[PDB]
């Protein structure tokens with residue numbers, strides 16, 4: 644072991660995330676991303692389907708890791724004195740949905756439907772694996788511009804999925820459901836549907852619908868862009884004040900607006916010039 648194995652490129656970003664660097668597996672030049680998370684700053688630990696102390700992020704990543712390209716793969720990880728180092732895949736070329744939206748503005752419905760569909764499949768995948776992501780949002784989605792495939796990233800606020808209530812949250816507040824803001828409780832799935840509601844609004848209008856606590860609590864959605872009535876209908880549904888008034892993933896995917904999505908390949912051809 645040890646990082647004579649990878650060649651550390653430029654810093655790609657930093658935050659509550661820690662710091663992510665571009666990398667190249669020296670073995671075969673596979674593009675990779677090297678995430679460093681400091682121990683002091685990690686609140687949630689778990690332990691491996693073998694038993695040694697790791698951050699939950701790595702548990703979660705290990706549970707979702709597979710052939711499915713809809714969630715970033717964990718390639719490997721190391722422990723250091725005050726940090727863990729995660730080696731993740733890196734699509735190339737790549738752009739995060741935030742930058743993409745910053746740069747191209749409100750997305751056309753055709754494009755948002757394909758992107759949104761792929762997010763749905765990704766999140767469903769996580770749920771099939773027992774992992775709840777807890778921070779679904781445009782900065783946590785990567786676009787593989789060549790294949791037109793979205794990848795979900797950053798499980799550093801995830802949890803194991805369960806059917807009982809959550810009384811802790813450390814995702815993004817502006818994407819968090821009203822029940823979180825008032826009572827500090829939420830159930831997982833329905834809280835994801837709320838953030839998917841925010842996400843689809845973000846895509847189709849170019850920005851999140853709510854900045855403030857009272858706007859979330861109120862949950863009146865105003866539309867700043869031209870958006871089809873069906874789209875609005877689905878957005879408003881996801882953003883129902885009462886959790887159980889929200890659609891299941893199956894109801895979302897069978898919604899009229901989600902009909903006849905482009906394959907990811909056709910998506911890149913049409914909308915990404917690839």
Ligand SMILES: O=c1[nH]c(-c2ccccc2Cl)nc2c1oc1ccc(Br)cc12
Pocket residue numbers: 655656657658660661662663676678715731732733734737782796797798
């Ligand atoms: O977990 C991540 N957080 C972040 C992230 C997000 C927002 C702000 C700062 C960082 Cl480090 N980026 C990535 C993360 O995993 C990645 C895998 C491949 C590539 Br390319 C990028 C990432």
